[PDB]
Structures are given as structure tokens and as C-alpha cells.
């Protein structure tokens, strides 16, 4: 059911909007459009964010919400970024998750319709610890959706690794 309304602070002041509670800090900004900027997770939890404490919640498509509504992502158009759909297979079992829109260190991302489609989030280091340097997406926007975690950096579902030899990938096992 709903997360408790009593310990939620949601606020927008001009061109910065924040949905927060005791575990989530979800920040969006206006430059020429509203975009999700950063989301910081003290812990990940499974309840629905209440409507009473949600900005811009009219005519919301659940599959557009970056942070899935099933893990208390607000049902808010602030919880969106052009070029990305819901991150249901992000690395939601990791600790110290921060989601932002920047390159994982030592990597690059190219937009091309050659890319494979959305799948589970992949960590930028292989099982043995090699860095995968090149990535693509069909039609995501840049800078790319990334998750920084206590175990490495991961890209959003849209962004797929570009490899030229056999490699073992570490991929998210979660579906949220």
C-alpha cells in the first residue's frame, strides 16, 4: 500500500523540485524542460508514494516513470527524463545507490539504431573486473542514465555494452 505521508517532504521552489522521505531524495530541475536530475537512495523500499505528496501527477503513464512506482517512485512527471522509460531492471539490490545523468568513468555512449533493445542493467566492469568502454542506445538522450553503487557503476536499461570478444557480464537480477 502507500508509504506513510507523515514523514514525507515534497517541494518545488521555482525551477528545482524535490520529492523526499526518510530514504529517498528525488530531485528534478527545469532548464528548458523539466528533467529528473538525481535520485539518492538510503535504502530501496517497496510501497507506493502517496498522491497527496506528489507534484505534477495528472495524466501519468507508469511506464515513463524512471524510478518504478512499485519501489516508491513518485507518480509524477518530475520522475521522467526524455529518452528513458521505467528502470524496472535497474540494479535495485545494490547498496548506496545514486542515479544521475552522466557517463560512468572511462566510458562512452553512442546513439544508433544498430543497438540492441532495452534489457537488464549492466555493470561497467565485467566479472573479472575489466572495464567495458563503449556502449550504445537506440534512442536514449545524453548524458546517459547511470547508477553509482557500492559495487561499481551501471547504466540504465536502454544503454547496452559494445563488445568485440567473449566476456562475462554482470547484470541486474532484479525486476521491480
Amino acid at each position: 500500500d502507500e508509504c506513510d505521508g507523515a514523514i514525507i517532504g515534497t517541494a518545488v521552489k521555482g525551477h528545482v523540485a524535490v520529492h523526499s522521505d526518510l530514504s529517498y531524495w528525488i530531485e528534478s530541475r527545469y532548464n528548458d524542460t523539466w528533467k529528473l536530475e538525481r535520485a539518492v537512495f538510503g535504502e530501496v523500499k517497496s510501497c507506493t508514494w502517496p498522491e497527496t505528496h506528489t507534484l505534477w501527477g495528472d495524466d501519468v503513464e507508469e511506464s515513463e516513470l524512471i524510478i518504478p512506482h512499485t519501489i516508491a517512485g513518485p507518480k509524477s512527471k518530475h520522475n521522467r527524463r526524455e529518452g528513458y522509460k521505467t528502470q524496472n531492471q535497474g540494479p535495485w539490490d545494490e547498496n548506496g545507490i545514486v542515479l544521475d545523468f552522466d557517463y560512468c568513468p572511462g566510458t562512452k555512449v553512442t546513439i544508433t539504431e544498430d543497438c540492441s533493445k532495452r534489457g537488464p542493467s549492466v555493470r561497467t566492469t565485467t566479472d573479472s573486473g575489466k572495464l567495458i568502454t563503449d556502449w550504445c542506445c537506440r534512442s536514449c538522450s545524453l548524458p546517459p542514465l547511470r547508477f553509482r553503487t557500492e559495487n561499481g557503476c551501471w547504466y540504465g536499461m536502454e544503454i547496452r555494452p559494445v563488445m568485440h570478444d567473449e566476456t562475462t557480464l554482470v547484470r541486474s537480477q532484479v525486476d521491480a
Copy 2:
């Protein structure tokens, strides 16, 4: 003055203690001793954490508090880790800060009294982007205190870089 008591959740349940508010998630654990485990910062702020919402707050030395009381670190013996003093010159101007006790990727830390003393936190990549691989501390404990941020990984004040040639260091400019 004090941060607002109204939007604070502080709880301990057996061997896991959490001090949280709308921006901070500060977690400690008991294994054989109580130690700070992780602290996640949606934003960094400057007010004092109220006593009313502080665990284990008797006979507290301010210079022992990992997260300085001046940036709303709780005045709590849960906010401590053997071998470390207050991180007043941690990288507190960065975004998406997570503090935990693990190695920055590709690095190692040795305890030796050869080390230089506590100073400002240093990022593990130089100005030009080279990785500093070797580090020391006089008498910190392992695993080392680290800050993961949207701009790289940084070590706690105690942990100093070990270099064999001229290099430009990126160091914290903050004193909190």
C-alpha cells in the same frame, strides 16, 4: 541552530541503528562493536541534529564524530568508527555523496607510521585523470573510510596518497 525534529526518524532494532531525516541516511551496525557502516546524503546541510532524536548521546567527544556535528552529524557514538576522527575536510561540496568503509576502485591502503598526518581529502584521480593506486594511513582501521561522489572516489582525511613522481592532486577545499 537545530534541524527540525518533526521530520526525523531515528531507530535501532537490535544490531542495526539508523539516524535519518529528509536528506541524511546514517546507518551503524553491531558485529562485535558498533561501527558506522554507511551514510548517504541527498544534500549536505548545516544545522545541528537534535538530541531528542539522537541515540547513544552521553559523553560524546565532538572530534570523534565521523560526520561533523556542524553539518548535522548526530552527536552520537553511532557516528564513529575506530581509527578515524571527524571528517571536517571531507569532500562536502560534492553531489551524491555516499560514505562507506571499502577501497576506492583500483586502490590499496597500508597502515604504517611512515605516513604523513591527517589533511584534506584527496580524490583518487589526479587533475589530468590518472589513478593514484597506493595510499597509507598512520593508524586508521581497514577497510578504509571512502566517499563516493558524482566526481569520483575520495578517501578520508587520515588516508594519504603515496606517489613517486610530480602529480597535481585534487583535494577538498571544505572545512565543515
